[PDB]
């Protein structure tokens, strides 16, 4: 939809705790409407989730 | 899909650490190729994602 | 040491995503010198994580 | 105690979603008696817990 990220898209976090890999799903809360899915590039199968504003898309 | 959930089912953990309330999203890997991500009817905005084979659904 | 909370007490998110329930161990990173893990009071079995300023005792 | 790591022990996950990096707390519950967090090695500041069992010590 309006989506800022796409399956597939290389994500890191902005600030904070890091966390660097592949957009692999989405999820949608009224505290965070716009959540993201994001399976780590460093350690295969572990996936964390995080609000749209954490995330930017990297090369 | 053939996904097993639709957004707003209500779900649990059928065994191990507890968690229950509403499917909010979804996420695919290799590892787990069908996952939900459930926010808690509990702790409103804390949400936890699980393999399909996790979780069922109640009424 | 000079630790804000106790095993057992009972804690709450101040804001955000809530949780609740007691404290069942900790952790120290550089990003979080002093921080929490709590087991939910409604979930029991699922534990998460916080730094010592996200939290607050309750009776 | 008789604890299996301590504060500063490289570790990873023996299966399933990898994750490898040093022993910077612990908690137990009832499900977990004995569970530790770590700091991945990769992903500075990001800490994800786990039951001992899941777990095993390297170089």
Chains 1, 2, 3, 4 share one sequence.
């Not at 800022?4 to 409407?33: E, H």
């Not at 959540?35 to 996936?47: I, K, R």
């Not at 504003?53 to 990297?58: D, G, K, N, T, V």
Request: with cysteine.
């Amino acid at each position: 939809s309006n989506a800022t990220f796409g399956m597939g898209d290389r994500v890191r976090k902005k600030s904070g705790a890091a966390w660097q890999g592949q957009i692999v799903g989405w999820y949608c809360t009224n505290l965070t409407p716009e959540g993201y899915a994001v399976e780590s590039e460093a350690h295969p199968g572990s996936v964390q989730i995080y609000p749209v504003a954490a995330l930017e898309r990297i090369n």
